[PDB]
């Protein structure tokens, strides 16, 4: 239930006297969560009149 080399392992990003402290780096790839999107259904078809600048 146990293998040799167990007390002599080298652990790269584990620090401390006995290599217990984690020092690893976080990996980020852009994804962000802010809130659900919404699509309007009245805007698609209706009566429209343009008054801009008159």
């Amino acid at each position: 239930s146990d293998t040799p080399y167990k007390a002599d392992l080298s652990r790269v990003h584990w620090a401390g006297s006995n290599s217990d402290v984690d020092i690893h780096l976080e990996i980020f790839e852009g994804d962000v969560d802010s809130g659900f999107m919404y699509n309007s259904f009245f805007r698609g078809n209706s009566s429209y009149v343009s008054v801009q600048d008159q």
Binding site: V51, Q52, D53, Q54
Partner: protein, 54 residues
């Protein structure tokens, strides 16, 4: 600069003399004229985008 200068001067006088008398001598006088600019004149007008769009 903000100043300009001009010079001014006086004239002489005629006198009379007879034998044995000394000749009098008269000193001309000087001054100056200076003009300065201090005040700005302007006209300004402002409008709002909400009123511009209509």
């Amino acid at each position: 600069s903000n100043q300009a200068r001009i010079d001014r001067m006086n004239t002489v006088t005629i006198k009379g003399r007879t034998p044995g008398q000394k000749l009098d001598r008269e000193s001309v006088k000087n001054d100056k004229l200076v003009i300065t600019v201090d005040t700005v004149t302007y006209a300004s007008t402002v409008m709002d985008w909400q009123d511009d769009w209509t």
